[model samples]
Target: MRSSLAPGVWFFRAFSRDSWFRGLILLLTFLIYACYHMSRKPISIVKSRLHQNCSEQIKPINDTHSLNDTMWCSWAPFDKDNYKELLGGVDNAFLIAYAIGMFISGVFGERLPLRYYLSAGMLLSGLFTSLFGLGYFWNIHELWYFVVIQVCNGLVQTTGWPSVVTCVGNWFGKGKRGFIMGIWNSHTSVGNILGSLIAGIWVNGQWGLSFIVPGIITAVMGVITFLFLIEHPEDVDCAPPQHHGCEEPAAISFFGALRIPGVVEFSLCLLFAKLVSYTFLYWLPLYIANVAHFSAKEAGDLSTLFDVGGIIGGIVAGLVSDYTNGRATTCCVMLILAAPMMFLYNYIGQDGIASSIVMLIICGGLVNGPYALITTAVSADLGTHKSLKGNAKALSTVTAIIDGTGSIGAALGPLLAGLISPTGWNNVFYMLISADVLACLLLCRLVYKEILAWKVSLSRGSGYK
Candidate 1:
């Protein structure tokens, strides 16, 4: 058999071993996914700047200002009374397309070479992302233009998760994935923070740069994907992990991935868990500004506390799940504890800066912990489930099903919050608490099974080993 020349053989020598190659794959996937989040976050930051208050503009007492509306100088499509509804339409286009596109993407991802699929997706993603900014350059005002770009962007962005999860799972195999995935989840938060900083810097000056810069970064990463990302170790003649063995079954079908035990349970669990986490992701700054009487800048800065807590929550959940060998149990525990923490945050979180910060972190950790565990570690675990019969290709499809379902919940959270918020803030918290409870209930069966397994192991005198 002939082997292809590896990408790094001539350039680097010390890190050419299979173990280091696995680490390299891990880093590449991390950065790739990071770029995914970074590119998506700019739109939200750009939104506020597009329709800010024009009440502070200089005016003369004798000047006949026809400025009855406070948002005088706001962007055209978003400057009217219908701005909120208009923006919601844009968001819907993206969210709806992303959810549907994700389901089909995984099937095709398995069929296509991951290198080609990911890079191509990233390339198109960058094109569309940059196109939105170019709308600013072109002085475009048609709402359809932005909406169309979002829809295409959403579809192409679906290429990221299943591809990266499958790639990393193929490299690392089945052992202690929880901690590695947990740590790997930081890429999400890092990219978001970077997006916030980058967007806000240019938002007031020229919001177009915010979108274009991230678009350029996305394209660069796409090129990197094409050049260096190895789909599997076999391509480079590296030794396979024992888990891969020799037999290679074809990728599992979507419904087949659904049939795997705990897939529905975790996916449903993620539905509600992600619902709560996404609410915070989209609404925390606004919530803080409304309740805490802080400036927009202060509230936005404080909102970052939630993501910081999320990084902690992800790492903690992964570590505990790894130690106990109970993925479901870890998620169940966090969801249970999260209910009260959420109620408390909603009630007292804005009492003071210190209290707000503390509550935000706790709520962030508890809400996001399960979401992180389910998406990365649990998705990979089930992807390579024992029932698959050495089907290494199953991971991508399985990952897609889980995250595709979760994306529905992600879109629903903010939309629901937007609806309930006008009635009362308490109503929003009640909705969130109910989501937490429901998420926990969905996991009860899996948690019970995990506990029984633990008990059997203890009774057999091989508890911790």
Candidate 2:
């Protein structure tokens, strides 16, 4: 349920007055990002509706074209012979725009007030999201129209991640980085699930409404963000104020952060790991609809299970990395396993309902685990590396590099999925498996360092014993 439905539950929380704002900020940021994901998800859910199989459906009484054109009931532009390629182009417009804009967005996000920046983004994002759906209502079929809107929305959406995480980190501080963020980073999967459910609702009926409804939610959330978001501890006067000597953090560039060990390693790993994750993010529903012949709603709804696995998988990653002190090993192992899991899911995902569920969950955990780790935990850890001598407040820059690079892969993976899908989905899975192996291979140096440290520690301990 949406939070506004029960406002009393949030306001009457058990936490202390000082901490209530903290808790509220957490949930507020959570809901805001969720709305963003909810808005984007409609495309994936509604893609099935855009160019459906028209042969089985009833047509207008005088439709002589139905006899010759099997796509008579489908939307124009998308009903063309290269519909999949057209859709892929749409995904590219959005994803590529996001990849480029994300790096720039964070730099500006640091300069602007987090509240205004994010709220403004939500408003812009909501408008474009709503506009995409309005095309369905307005019967607008010009592909460029949708592409332009998608590009605009993708650019605006970049504002949310950087601003919200900075706000949340400003409040939470450096304690339990992995554990808290593992739970917090769940915003990704949680948002994805809510988006799937919200989009699934209208996909089959009036597919446009899927985007509009979520779009409205995003705008409303933005309004709340403007009204309620406490941007920093200093705003609310949280105790023991942490005032630095200078008001602004010193400037740091992308390569400035890249100069550390394990930084470049995980950054490249994120590039390939997110390639696998986002490929599934944008394509899994369509894949299910095609392979299992499930309804648009069924496919969209079933896809949420992957996110559920993602929710747990991130926590598992945080837990293992925290205890084992082996972020690289944990991520590499998951990526290594993910390759075969993708292979298995491709071959036997639809064997039965039970089997499909298991395969998707398992595959989701593996695909998303390393991707989640590198972005939240690994980036934060490396930003404060001992080599930096603790003066580096370059977390945002480092994250921009990691996420920005990975977003490129995120764009390419789906476009690749779109182009290759026509020939054979098996080839697509091979491509994904290859991507996973590459992601795993990139982490080998870090994994080797981690194990070598353990070996030296063991050798010293044996001598002491």
Candidate 3:
């Protein structure tokens, strides 16, 4: 039998006056997170435009050596024959630093004020994001300049996830968190969509402008976050939502949260899930441009449709899960749906406009729906797992651990795609499919446990078992 609230139980409305502050918190926090994605999205749009070959003749590799280390043969494929390599280098630099920094950032998130930490990270991220563009404007040619910026930017960007998740988790309760966060988290997809369109607008002329624009936007948002983002209403002695019951719980320390049963599993599981998502984020534009014969702008515009579907998928997943009373089931459904769609997208995405649109929307929804919810609401649920007995403070640590672990996958996914994309797009799809399958497999045990527990409770209550 489901545990019922007592007769006099007073339930707080979802967006009541006391809870209305949540809207502002969610909006401001969404903007901060969106800007982060915006800063990171330029590379995918600009990769094709970055380095155009000046040479006319297809010179032999051995003939190209020079003091500037420039290649001699000019008949390059698109712009730079080494564009893939350069893109890969930039991606790995960020991933490596991100992977390393996330663990530390989680611990630090618990220690410092989120506004200062997240704002500083965004400011630095904007600075570095813009610096990459400045390198273009200044006509700088060294590879390491870009690489160093990516590494530092990646390190600083780790501050955003733990801080945002912890802050958002503080405001929302478990019930309908999946649905609410699912919609709220659409900002990630929205940012990606907006960034792609903005960058695509200038991609043909000067790819540097792509970076510069989003960088400026993010820097501006960082200031807003510092000025306006609130961690929790309780911090100001305002009443928090009574949906989870009155008297907000105290926050927990880092080590205390790690002891939660599902923290490590969910964290590791998120790694594979995010790897697939990040790979799509970094490589999808290039794949569209190259395979579909789209102009840089067309490819960038079309890419937003994928994110559009993602926004829809996320909200739908949240609502469906809320109805079904199963968070893991929601993820499993989307992941299962996504596995085949990934394969289908690779096969058909390059065909033409008709095939492209159909596949992009399907693939986008299948991939990002579960991914968005898992990272936000599911992590929140598992973090505040009732089994932990109201140790709500662990929310930040649990969120950090899950998302931090996912960062490893986030880094690896794109790096692997970079390597495989050289072989052919087919191999890249294969890698993605395998990762998705593994992600589903990771959730199988959790789903099974949840089902068994639900059934057991049902049977005991009705005296049927």
Candidate 4:
């Protein structure tokens, strides 16, 4: 058995030996990543409150301004003069910065220490989130002010994904990786669920406070991350799970991982899936309020149920993929089922509470299940692609590339919905359906490749080992 001369490649060789230490590292990483979502989810819940009337009958504005027509869930007082567009522009500012920054964050993430970089990002994110809320307290209505904050916040938020993925990958292995990452990945849903409820509690009273509170929480978590997040088990004298019995090696380079065949395909597939998921995140509450006739409070409450289903869905996706030993199969099946569900939810959801709840849950689970898995498990699988020879330095780089590309979808999904929503809610759902189907289409080649690889491995007596 000849080992490769590559410095770090030997370290990532299969079935290498430290389980307990790796688990601990992963647990902490999960908490840190989950808190990032916790801060983000509040914005969705608060957007309606911040922009809408506080009284009953969440009505659209009956004014002369074109911006009033753009307001989706409810109208702003004295905002009859293009205010909604201003607000939408504010939202877009953050997303645009977010979309652009995500691409570069991974490249930088590979160069920096994960703990410091992520902690700084979290701290800055907290500050900007809090500043956005402070606009209300300070009686500030200058739209560009909010836009600047969102842009800065979005740029800082880029630090969250690549950093966490790189750290988590340093701990875990490929065996049963999908299932483990899937269950752990439910933190995204959990964060959204908690953020919705917490923000909703104060949204009606003061939308500013909703953002403020979450901002504080994330800042605190950032400090906690600085103090606690372990970059890798070896930092504490423990080996990574797969390297329990082995010697530690040098870190790998970013380009080393790019040579893998499937990463690009998987990255593109993730773009559409993520775009749909983010669209739902930003627009679901508005959809429920207008189409389903729920009050802002009721709509926000109902939206949380979708995230609750997502938690279960993510775990289920991971477990299912593990059993099938087919990541692409898992993603394809979920996306295919999800596309029709999106249409059903849009068309049938407004009929009644029973129908809406059923549709919301089904739609949420089907859409988010594979979303959670692909971003976590599939990314991990691709990051550790067998050809990488064990150096995972590109973990953050790969995560950034996939998620950064996906952020384009994330940015466009909401902006497009905001643009098209006036035509009809059905139009928005149609967009989502198309995106989900395209995501599935992108996965087909990857699925075929994985299947062929599986057949070859089996014939060689080494499938899924």
lDDT per residue for candidate 3 within 207-243, as digits (tens), equals: 6787888888888888988888778777767776433
Better of 2 and 3 by lDDT: 2
lDDT of 3: 0.75
lDDT of 2 by residue, 337-389 (tens): 77667767767866767787888788778877777778877776665456765
Candidate 3 residue-wise lDDT at 254? 70
lDDT of 1 by residue, 17-111 (tens): 78788888989998999999989998988877777776675544554567547445678888878877988888789998999899899899888
**Candidate 3 — worst ten consecutive residues by lDDT sum?**
67-76
Error of 2 at 209 (Å): 2.9
lDDT of each: 0.82, 0.76, 0.75, 0.74
Instruction: TM-score winner between 1 and 4, please give it.
Output: 1
- Runs of candidate 1 with Cα error greater than 4 angstroms are 1-16, 59-72, 244-248, 280-295, 346-351, 463-465
User: Going through the candidates in order, what is the number of backbone clashes in each?
Assistant: 0, 0, 3, 5
Look at candidate 4 and give me any clashing residue pairs.
16-242, 17-242, 17-244, 18-241, 18-244
Instruction: Using lDDT, give the best candidate's number.
Output: 1
Ranking by lDDT, best first?
1, 2, 3, 4
Whole-model lDDT, model 4: 0.74
What lDDT does model 2 reach?
A: 0.76
Give the worst 10-residue stretch by lDDT in candidate 4. 69-78
Candidate 3 or 2, higher TM-score: 2
